[PDB]
Amino acid sequence: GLKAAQKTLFPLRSIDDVVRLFAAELGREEPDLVLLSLVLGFVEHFLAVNRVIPTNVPELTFQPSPAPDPPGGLTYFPVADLSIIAALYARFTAQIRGAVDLSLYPREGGVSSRELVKKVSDVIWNSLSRSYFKDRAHIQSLFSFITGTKLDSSGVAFAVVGACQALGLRDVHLALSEDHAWVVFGPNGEQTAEVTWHGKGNEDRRGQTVNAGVAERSWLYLKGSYMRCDRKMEVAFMVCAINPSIDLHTDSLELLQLQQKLLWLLYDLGHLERYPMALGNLADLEELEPTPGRPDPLTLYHKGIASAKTYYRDEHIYPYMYLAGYHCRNRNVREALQAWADTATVIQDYNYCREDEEIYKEFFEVANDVIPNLLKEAASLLEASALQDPECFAHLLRFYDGICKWEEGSPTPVLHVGWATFLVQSLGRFEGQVRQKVRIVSGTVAGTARGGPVLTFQSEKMKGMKELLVATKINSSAIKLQLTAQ
Amino acid sequence: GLKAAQKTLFPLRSIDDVVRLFAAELGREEPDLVLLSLVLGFVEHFLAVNRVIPTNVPELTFQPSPAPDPPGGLTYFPVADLSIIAALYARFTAQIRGAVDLSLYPREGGVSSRELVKKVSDVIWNSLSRSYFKDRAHIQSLFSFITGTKLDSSGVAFAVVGACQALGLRDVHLALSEDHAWVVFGPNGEQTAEVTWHGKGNEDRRGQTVNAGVAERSWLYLKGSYMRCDRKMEVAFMVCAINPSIDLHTDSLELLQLQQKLLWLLYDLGHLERYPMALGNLADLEELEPTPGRPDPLTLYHKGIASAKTYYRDEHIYPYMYLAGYHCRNRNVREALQAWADTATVIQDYNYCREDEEIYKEFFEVANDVIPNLLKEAASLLEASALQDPECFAHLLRFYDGICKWEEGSPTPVLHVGWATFLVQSLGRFEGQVRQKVRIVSGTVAGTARGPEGPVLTFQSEKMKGMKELLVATKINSSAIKLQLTAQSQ
Numbered sequence A: 001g002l003k004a005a006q007k008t009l010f011p012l013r014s015i016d017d018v019v020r021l022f023a024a025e026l027g028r029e030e031p032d033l034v035l036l037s038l039v040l041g042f043v044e045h046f047l048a049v050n051r052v053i054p055t056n057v058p059e060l061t062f063q064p065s066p067a068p069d070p071p072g073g074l075t076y077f078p079v080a081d082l083s084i085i086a087a088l089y090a091r092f093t094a095q096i097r098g099a100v101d102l103s104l105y106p107r108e109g110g111v112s113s114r115e116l117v118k119k120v121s122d123v124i125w126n127s128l129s130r131s132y133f134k135d136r137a138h139i140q141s142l143f144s145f146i147t148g149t150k151l152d153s154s155g156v157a158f159a160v161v162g163a164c165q166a167l168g169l170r171d172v173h174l175a176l177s178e179d180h181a182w183v184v185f186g187p188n189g190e191q192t193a194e195v196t197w198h199g200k201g202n203e204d205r206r207g208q209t210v211n212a213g214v215a216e217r218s219w220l221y222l223k224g225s226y227m228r229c230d231r232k233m234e235v236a237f238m239v240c241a242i243n244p245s246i247d248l249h250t251d252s253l254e255l256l257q258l259q260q261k262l263l264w265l266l267y268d269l270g271h272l273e274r275y276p277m278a279l280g281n282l283a284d285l286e287e288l289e290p291t292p293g294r295p296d297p298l299t300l301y302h303k304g305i306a307s308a309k310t311y312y313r314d315e316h317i318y319p320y321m322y323l324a325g326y327h328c329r330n331r332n333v334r335e336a337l338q339a340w341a342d343t344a345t346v347i348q349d350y351n352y353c354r355e356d357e358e359i360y361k362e363f364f365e366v367a368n369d370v371i372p373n374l375l376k377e378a379a380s381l382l383e384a385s386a387l388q389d390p391e392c393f394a395h396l397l398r399f400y401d402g403i404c405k406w407e408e409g410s411p412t413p414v415l416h417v418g419w420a421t422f423l424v425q426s427l428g429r430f431e432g433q434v435r436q437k438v439r440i441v442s443g444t445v446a447g448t449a450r451g452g453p454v455l456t457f458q459s460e461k462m463k464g465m466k467e468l469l470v471a472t473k474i475n476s477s478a479i480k481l482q483l484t485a486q
Numbered sequence B: 001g002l003k004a005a006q007k008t009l010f011p012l013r014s015i016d017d018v019v020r021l022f023a024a025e026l027g028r029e030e031p032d033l034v035l036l037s038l039v040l041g042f043v044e045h046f047l048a049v050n051r052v053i054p055t056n057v058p059e060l061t062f063q064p065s066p067a068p069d070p071p072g073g074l075t076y077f078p079v080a081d082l083s084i085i086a087a088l089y090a091r092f093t094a095q096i097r098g099a100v101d102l103s104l105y106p107r108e109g110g111v112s113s114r115e116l117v118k119k120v121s122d123v124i125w126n127s128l129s130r131s132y133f134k135d136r137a138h139i140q141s142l143f144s145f146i147t148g149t150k151l152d153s154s155g156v157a158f159a160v161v162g163a164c165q166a167l168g169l170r171d172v173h174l175a176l177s178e179d180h181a182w183v184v185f186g187p188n189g190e191q192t193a194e195v196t197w198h199g200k201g202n203e204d205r206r207g208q209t210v211n212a213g214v215a216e217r218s219w220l221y222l223k224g225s226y227m228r229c230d231r232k233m234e235v236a237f238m239v240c241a242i243n244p245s246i247d248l249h250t251d252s253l254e255l256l257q258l259q260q261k262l263l264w265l266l267y268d269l270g271h272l273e274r275y276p277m278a279l280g281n282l283a284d285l286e287e288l289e290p291t292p293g294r295p296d297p298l299t300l301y302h303k304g305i306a307s308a309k310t311y312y313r314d315e316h317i318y319p320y321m322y323l324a325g326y327h328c329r330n331r332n333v334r335e336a337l338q339a340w341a342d343t344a345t346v347i348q349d350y351n352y353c354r355e356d357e358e359i360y361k362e363f364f365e366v367a368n369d370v371i372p373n374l375l376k377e378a379a380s381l382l383e384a385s386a387l388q389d390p391e392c393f394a395h396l397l398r399f400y401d402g403i404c405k406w407e408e409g410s411p412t413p414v415l416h417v418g419w420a421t422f423l424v425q426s427l428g429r430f431e432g433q434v435r436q437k438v439r440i441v442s443g444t445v446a447g448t449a450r451g452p453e454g455p456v457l458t459f460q461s462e463k464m465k466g467m468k469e470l471l472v473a474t475k476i477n478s479s480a481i482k483l484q485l486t487a488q489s490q
C-alpha cells in the first residue's frame, strides 16, 4: 500500500534520484521507513553485494553515466523500478498486517501496549533465518530482511520500528546506544523494551526494559543518555547504516557519494542535530571526498562534540574518538593526545561490564597501539616538537587517569599486564626534564572570588603513583605493579 | 513434429495415462525429454499453479474420478489434449531449431563442440526470465519455459539438454551435483560446461568448465563424484523435478501420486540405480502413502546410500540425511544420531565455500535444532533408553568432529556462537556416568602384526581433539567448550 505520491518518483535511475525520494519523504510527517530502507537495500545489493549485472531479469535494468576521473569511463547504477520495490514493499506489509491483529490489542489513548510491542518484535524475530552469521555486512536493510530473512543486530530493532509504523503505531520509536539498539514507546516515550541481541549471540534480554542496563552505569546503556529517535532521526540511522564496503579494502564510490549526500540533506533539515555519530560519520566522509562550500571535517567533529554535550550530558565516547582519529591521521600529536585524554575523561564515570567489550577494544588499541605508535613516529622526527612539550605528557597522564577511574567500581578489571609495558614504553618517551615540568596537585583553594602544565588525578592508582611518573628514572617495575591490582 | 507412435497415447485423461505415456517413452533409445517435460509441466500447471477450471478456455477439458477417503468427493484431472501438447511441442522445437543453424558448426564423429553447446545455452539464456527477487515454484519445466519464459536455475540446464536433443545431439547430457547443474558433452563425456547461475551473489561461471569447483573440494561439485546422466536418468530427473507444492503448507495429492508411480516405473526399469536422491525421493513418498507389495521406506534409503558408495565414492550427503530424517520421524534416536554422524563423516572430507550455503543451513538445522529435539523428547520418555547409551553419545561426538573437520582448510569458517549453546546442551543430555564410558583414543600403534570395552572414538579434527577431556568430565565446562568450538587463525 504505497501512496501515489510515492510512486510518482519511480523509477530511480541515479544517486540524485534517490536523494530526491529522501527529500520527498522527509517532507511528510511520517517518512515511510520501510520504503526508504528497501530502496537503500536494493541499491546496496548491486553496488556492493552482487555487482554482476543480470541480463535476463524482468524489470531489472542498469543506468549508465559518466564516472569521475581519474577512472573516467562509465558507471552503472541499478534502476529501482517501481514494480520490484513495490512488490518487495507489499511483501513486508502483508507479512506484518497478517501476523498482527490490532483488534486483539486494546490500544487506548494512542499508546501502544507492552504486549503489542512484544508481539510485533516477536513476528520480526521468528521470521529470521536460524543459521546465518550475524556479524555479516549488508544485512541491515529491510531489503535484506524480505529477500534473505537475514538481519544484523540493530537491523532487527530498526525492522521492529518499521513494522510498527506500517501498523499505524506512531508512538513506537528506535532507541540507539553507541553500540546497541532497542525500542521506546508509551505515553511520555518513557517505556522501553529490548528487541534484539547484543555482542556474541546473547539474544537473552528480549522483552525486558533497559532499567538495569542504565543503573549499572555500563557504556552500553549510556547511563540513560542514549538516543531516543523520531521518524526523522530513524531516517538518519538507516543512512548511517548504509555500508559502502565491497570487501575488506574496497568501497563502492556510488555508495560513498550517496550516503554523503543523504547526510547533508539530513544535516540541512537539521535532523543530525541530536546525532553526534552521524555528524562524525559525515565528517569522516568529508576527509575522503570534501564537497565544496561545506564545513571542514574539524568543524563537523566539533559539532558532534557540542551535540553530545548539549543533549547527551557529554556521556558519549565516540565524538572524541572521531576527533582523535583525525588528529592521528594528520600527525597533530598534541591535539591527538588531548582528544584521547578527553575521551578517557568521559569513560571515567562509567563502570566496565562484559557488554561493553567494544569500547574496551577501542581504548585498548588506543593505549597499546595508537599512542605508542604516535610517539615513536614522533621520536623518529626528532632523532632526525611534541616530545619536548609537557602538555602532551600531561595529556597522556590524563588519558590513563580516566582509564584507572573507569576501572574503579567496575565488576571486571580493565587494566592488566598487557597495558603495563606500553605505559612504561610511552612514559619513557618523554625526557625526565620534560615530565618534571608537570605539577600534579590537589588544588589548594576551591572556586574563585569577585570581591608548565597543571594536572589533577581523579583515580586511585594514578594518584597513588604520583611520584613514580615524574622521576627521572622510570621505575619500570613499581609502575607495572601499581597499574595492576585487586 | 511428434512421431506417430506417440500420438496414439493422447488424450491423457488420468495419472495412469501419464504413466503409460512415460512407459512408452522409457522404452525407446531416446525418450522425448521435450514431450515428457511439456506433459508434466501441463499437468502440474492445472494441479498446483492455477487449479481454477477456466470458463473462457476452449480446448482444455477436465476428467473427474473418485477421490481418496476420508475426504471423498470427485477429483478433476486436466486432460492433456493432443492438439495442445503438439502445439506447445511444435512451439518449442520450432523456437529452438529457429535460433540455431546446425550447419554453422562442423560436428564430426557425432561429437558436439564447445561452441555449439555455448550457443544452444545462450539461446536458452536470452529467452528466459530469471526470478531474481523471489523463489518461484513450478517453473522447472519446458512447459513453463514456453508458456511464461520463467525458468529456475537447474531448469535452465535441463532446457539446454532438451534443446540439444531437439537438435538431435545425442551426446550432450545433464550433469547433476547435489545443488547445482551443468552440462556434459564431448567424446568420452569429459567435456563440462556451465549453462546456468547458482544462488545469488555468486559470480558468473557460464561457459567455463567445472574444473575449479572440483579442484576446490566444494560440495557444489562433489570433488568430481557428480552425476552424468544418460537420457533415461534425465527423464528420472524431470520426474524428481515434479513439484506438488500448492502453497507452503499444502500438497497436490495427485502430483504426489503421479510422481510416486513414475519413480516406481523408473525404478523397475533400473533407471534409479545410479541416482541416490531419486531413491531417497521415492522412499519419502513411500512413507506417505505406501504402495502394497513394494519395498519398505527403510529398504529404499539404504539402496540410495548403497548406490552412493558404488557409483559416487560415497561422497554424497543427501543419502544419509534422507535416512536420518526417516529415523528422527520414527523416534529411533539411535539410528538417527548414527545417520547424522555418518553424514558428518562424509562432509569432513570437504572444504566449505560460499556457494555451499545450502548444505550449511542443513547441517545447522541438524546440530542446533533436530538433534536437540531428539534428545529433549527423550529426557521426557525417561522421566515418564538412548540418553544413557554411550554409543549415542559417541555418535554425537563424531558428528561434531566431522563439522569441525569440514571447517579445517576452508576459505570461510563454519562454526559460530550460534552452534555453541546446543553442543553444550546436548553434551549435558548425557549423564557424566555415560559420557565417561566412552574412550577417546588417538591410537598408539599403526597397523597390526602376524607371528568387553565400551565405545572407542578417534577425532580427526584439531578442534574436537583439543577438547576431548572437557567432553567426558562430570562438570561440563560450558564456557570453555564454547570458547574452543570457535577459532580464527584467519
Ligand SMILES: COc1cc(-c2ccc(CN[C@H]3C[C@@H](O)[C@@H](N(C)c4ncnc5sc(CC(F)(F)F)cc45)C3)cc2)nnc1OC
Pocket: A154, A176, A177, A178, A179, A180, A181, A237, A240, A277, A278, A281, A318, A321, A322, A323, A324, A325, A326, A328, A329, A361, A362, A363, A365, A366, A370
Ligand atoms: C583505536 O584507535 C582508533 C580509534 C578511532 C575511532 C574513531 C571513530 C570511532 C567511531 N566509529 C564509528 C563508525 C560508525 O559505525 C559509528 N557507529 C557504530 C554508529 N554510527 C551511527 N549510528 C549508530 S547507532 C549505533 C548503535 C546500533 F548500532 F544501532 F546498535 C551505532 C552507530 C561508530 C571509533 C574509533 N580512530 N582512530 C584510532 O586510531 C587512529
Ligand SMILES: COc1cc(-c2ccc(CN[C@H]3C[C@@H](O)[C@@H](N(C)c4ncnc5sc(CC(F)(F)F)cc45)C3)cc2)nnc1OC
Pocket: B153, B154, B176, B177, B178, B179, B180, B181, B237, B240, B277, B278, B281, B318, B321, B322, B324, B325, B326, B328, B329, B362, B363, B365, B366, B370
Ligand atoms: C536438517 O534436519 C533434517 C534434514 C532432513 C533432510 C531430508 C532430506 C534431504 C534431501 N532433500 C532432498 C529434497 C529433493 O529436492 C532433493 N533435491 C535437491 C534433488 N532431488 C533430485 N535430483 C536433484 S538434482 C539437484 C541439483 C540441481 F537441482 F539439479 F541443480 C537437486 C536434486 C534433495 C535433506 C535433509 N531430514 N530430516 C531432518 O530432521 C528430521
